[PDB]
Amino acid sequence: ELSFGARAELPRIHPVASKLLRLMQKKETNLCLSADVSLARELLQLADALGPSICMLKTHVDILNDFTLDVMKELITLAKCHEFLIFEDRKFADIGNTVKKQYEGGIFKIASWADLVNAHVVPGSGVVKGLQEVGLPLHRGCLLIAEMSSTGSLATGDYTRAAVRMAEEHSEFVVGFISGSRVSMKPEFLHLTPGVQLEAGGDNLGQQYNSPQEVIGKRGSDIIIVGRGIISAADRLEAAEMYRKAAWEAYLSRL
Amino acid sequence: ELSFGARAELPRIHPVASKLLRLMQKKETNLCLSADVSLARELLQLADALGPSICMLKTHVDILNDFTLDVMKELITLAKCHEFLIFEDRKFADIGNTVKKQYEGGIFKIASWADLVNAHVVPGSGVVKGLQEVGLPLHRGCLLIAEMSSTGSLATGDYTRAAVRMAEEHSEFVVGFISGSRVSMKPEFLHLTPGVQLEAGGDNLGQQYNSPQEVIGKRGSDIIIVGRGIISAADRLEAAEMYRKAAWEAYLSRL
Ligand SMILES: O=c1cc(S)n([C@@H]2O[C@H](COP(=O)(O)O)[C@@H](O)[C@H]2O)c(=O)[nH]1
Ligand SMILES: O=c1cc(S)n([C@@H]2O[C@H](COP(=O)(O)O)[C@@H](O)[C@H]2O)c(=O)[nH]1
């Protein structure tokens, strides 16, 4: 097992992964903020205040009531100032021909500002090939959704394995997974795990939570994705710090 | 085995499904146009010219370069004038809490204009319960993706069986399936099938094509979804009419 810093230098490491792993080591953070807010000012205030505490900001641009490309320009400024990657949680899940247009075009022009995007493997490897035709020239990466956090999730067994194969066979664009645990034994791949809170529980629509120690420590993932655990707290800064120190120590102790 | 017009009056039928089934019978069409274009002017001219030939217009609003809600206003006017439903092919595929916001909010406000949307079942039934919270009040319907047309699709076997099961358990909101064939023996559910062209072929990003006669006649689906077989043709009206008459005769011969 290697540190984030050593993993950033692996021969087969993707540039976007390497960038990520370098700033994770530098800033002592393996926390991805899930900025699930509907107003751009909120988004930008959270990105500014929490920037120093996070390795990555996961967006859902399609829930932003006042999206504009300028909001994303301002977000990029914050990402560069504070050193975090931008991850648009689009869950591409269509045929290659359709996802290609969805990633490059429309109002959102997701490929123009997102270091990372993600995709479901359900359509087969066409979904990755289609995204790649846009992502590769723009030097972007992709995460494949190998497991989900929600109750009744079908991303289990052979579906999970099928996700792992697809990532391994498309390593020039695929940099890792959204998963509940380590699913690949190859150190070049990132594992990012949502459905994380300090306290036990869930929501009224199928979400289930596990702690950072569980996820990073016992299950061997690299990075926690946390939304309401931070966003609903009163002091979002202290809450981010708490999650960061939780995920970081879990990591060091596993090392 | 009942005609569309008869199925429209089935006891357990959804009001949206009943509206569709009636206009299908009346207009002699079981063709859904996949309006896969990036210009609002092109979308609206296709919707006006092809409107009399189609039971439904399927959108990917996220590829429209000049989307405004006004554009959707104008599409609704045409949908009412010519009698077809509007189907946003968003493929919701996240936790219940996330998809509820993606459906209702953001720039697109999908729920405000789409009669129908679809969802992947991989998250478990929470994806449907989240969408339902917005859609049921708005008298909308949802399609569950039971099978995909693309090479390497993982929507098979127990995955497909789980989709049918989730459909049958949320029948107050779910009106049917995106599938390759008939997957449910209950006639209140609609079966819509993509990957349809008159000629043999595919694309270079994993799409696979079958004929209206195959998909409606042998495999027993209700409605063909057709993109490029119409859109890339010179005469899009003549193309639509060819696909309509193929799908309608296919259905007539089954009954
Ligand atoms: O399996 C998943 C995958 C993701 S990316 N997510 C996302 O992580 C975030 C979880 O938010 P939380 O429950 O508020 O922490 C949401 O944006 C989800 O859409 C998830 O909840 N389950
Ligand atoms: O399994 C599917 C499901 C859908 S909805 N579709 C959609 O139908 C259309 C197929 O278009 P064509 O290949 O140009 O006919 C695209 O918009 C796809 O997103 C598909 O191709 N395969």
Side-chain angles (χ1 to χ4, degrees):
Chain A
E1 167 107 80
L2 304 159
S3 72
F4 295 138
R7 288 173 69 194
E9 303 188 343
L10 287 166
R12 294 177 62 74
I13 202 57
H14 185 282
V16 182
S18 170
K19 188 175 176 171
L20 175 62
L21 287 160
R22 258 182 278 121
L23 67 81
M24 288 165 71
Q25 191 109 299
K26 186 173 168 190
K27 298 162 56 169
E28 292 191 339
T29 182
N30 56 328
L31 172 62
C32 178
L33 177 57
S34 197
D36 295 337
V37 294
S38 37
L39 293 199
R41 193 65 243 152
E42 303 179 285
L43 178 51
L44 297 173
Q45 287 180 1
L46 289 162
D48 192 27
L50 282 54
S53 293
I54 67 171
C55 65
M56 177 189 307
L57 197 151
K58 188 177 75 63
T59 65
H60 280 304
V61 59
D62 60 336
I63 71 153
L64 212 54
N65 287 344
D66 48 1
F67 170 90
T68 72
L69 279 177
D70 194 60
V71 173
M72 312 317 290
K73 191 201 72 69
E74 194 28 51
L75 186 58
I76 286 159
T77 299
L78 296 178
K80 303 201 198 319
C81 175
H82 297 301
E83 291 185 290
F84 53 89
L85 303 212
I86 294 171
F87 167 21
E88 163 56 36
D89 184 7
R90 170 66 179 77
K91 295 182 168 71
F92 296 99
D94 216 323
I95 70 173
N97 197 63
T98 299
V99 303
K100 209 205 307 187
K101 303 186 205 176
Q102 295 180 314
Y103 182 27
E104 187 163 42
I107 305 320
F108 297 136
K109 291 201 88 56
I110 292 163
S112 84
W113 52 261
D115 299 289
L116 292 164
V117 289
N118 67 169
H120 278 303
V121 297
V122 71
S125 71
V127 65
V128 177
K129 295 159 180 310
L131 293 164
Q132 274 175 179
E133 294 192 352
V134 182
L136 285 167
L138 292 170
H139 305 74
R140 302 316 195 179
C142 197
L143 298 171
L144 300 190
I145 298 162
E147 303 179 319
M148 301 197 58
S149 70
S150 45
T151 98
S153 168
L154 299 175
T156 53
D158 298 313
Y159 186 102
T160 306
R161 294 180 265 275
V164 168
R165 295 183 260 267
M166 195 176 295
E168 290 173 339
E169 293 178 358
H170 292 92
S171 77
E172 86 175 327
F173 184 51
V174 176
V175 297
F177 306 95
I178 306 303
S179 54
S181 61
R182 175 174 318 173
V183 290
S184 175
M185 289 298 285
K186 289 170 187 237
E188 300 80 14
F189 286 142
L190 307 157
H191 300 84
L192 289 73
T193 295
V196 173
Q197 272 190 201
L198 301 182
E199 298 293 5
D203 70 14
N204 40 15
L205 294 164
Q207 178 70 300
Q208 311 176 94
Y209 293 124
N210 290 92
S211 77
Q213 191 174 83
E214 175 59 26
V215 153
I216 299 301
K218 318 305 172 230
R219 304 198 182 181
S221 196
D222 299 311
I223 291 168
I224 63 177
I225 298 172
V226 175
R228 294 167 274 179
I230 287 165
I231 301 297
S232 294
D235 178 358
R236 274 84 81 92
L237 189 35
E238 181 208 353
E241 281 291 290
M242 286 184 76
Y243 278 101
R244 180 192 65 79
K245 295 175 184 163
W248 194 253
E249 273 329 302
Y251 153 67
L252 292 176
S253 296
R254 190 186 74 223
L255 241 66
Chain B
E1 189 76 33
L2 302 171
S3 70
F4 298 129
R7 281 165 78 190
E9 299 176 353
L10 285 157
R12 293 185 60 89
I13 202 83
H14 195 283
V16 182
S18 185
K19 194 182 173 183
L20 187 53
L21 279 167
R22 297 203 116 89
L23 65 83
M24 284 162 68
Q25 196 83 334
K26 191 185 173 186
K27 293 171 70 180
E28 300 190 348
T29 178
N30 58 334
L31 169 56
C32 176
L33 177 70
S34 185
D36 288 335
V37 290
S38 60
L39 290 175
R41 176 82 265 125
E42 192 173 12
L43 174 62
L44 293 176
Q45 293 179 346
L46 288 159
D48 190 16
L50 272 59
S53 297
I54 67 178
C55 69
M56 187 183 297
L57 192 148
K58 183 180 72 69
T59 59
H60 290 292
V61 65
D62 68 329
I63 76 168
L64 206 60
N65 283 335
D66 51 3
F67 172 87
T68 72
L69 283 161
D70 203 55
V71 176
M72 305 325 287
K73 178 178 91 198
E74 186 47 62
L75 186 73
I76 290 162
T77 295
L78 290 172
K80 292 183 191 307
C81 181
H82 294 304
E83 305 191 64
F84 62 76
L85 294 190
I86 296 169
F87 164 29
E88 170 59 38
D89 186 5
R90 179 54 185 74
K91 296 196 167 71
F92 293 106
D94 211 319
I95 73 171
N97 192 71
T98 291
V99 302
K100 192 184 154 180
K101 302 174 179 186
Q102 290 177 323
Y103 188 23
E104 182 165 53
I107 289 283
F108 291 136
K109 297 200 99 12
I110 293 162
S112 71
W113 56 263
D115 299 290
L116 287 176
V117 289
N118 56 179
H120 280 300
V121 299
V122 58
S125 66
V127 67
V128 179
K129 294 172 213 321
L131 292 171
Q132 285 203 125
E133 310 230 339
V134 178
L136 277 163
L138 281 170
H139 294 69
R140 309 301 204 193
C142 182
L143 304 160
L144 297 186
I145 298 156
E147 308 187 307
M148 293 192 73
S149 59
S150 42
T151 304
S153 174
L154 300 170
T156 54
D158 290 334
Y159 190 108
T160 299
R161 289 188 281 281
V164 166
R165 202 146 67 254
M166 199 179 290
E168 262 150 37
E169 294 180 11
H170 292 94
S171 66
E172 59 183 353
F173 183 54
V174 168
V175 305
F177 310 97
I178 299 288
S179 60
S181 67
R182 179 185 289 184
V183 284
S184 174
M185 293 315 287
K186 303 181 170 187
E188 301 75 23
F189 292 105
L190 287 147
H191 293 95
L192 291 73
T193 303
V196 177
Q197 281 206 180
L198 291 191
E199 306 286 1
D203 68 14
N204 63 344
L205 287 173
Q207 180 62 308
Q208 309 176 111
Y209 293 112
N210 290 99
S211 70
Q213 186 186 104
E214 174 60 35
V215 159
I216 303 294
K218 323 303 139 188
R219 299 180 189 196
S221 170
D222 303 307
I223 295 155
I224 56 168
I225 294 165
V226 178
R228 288 167 282 182
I230 288 153
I231 300 305
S232 299
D235 185 352
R236 278 86 78 92
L237 177 54
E238 179 204 343
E241 277 294 284
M242 297 177 76
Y243 279 98
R244 180 188 72 71
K245 286 158 179 181
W248 192 255
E249 247 320 287
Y251 151 76
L252 281 180
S253 298
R254 212 169 65 213
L255 255 71

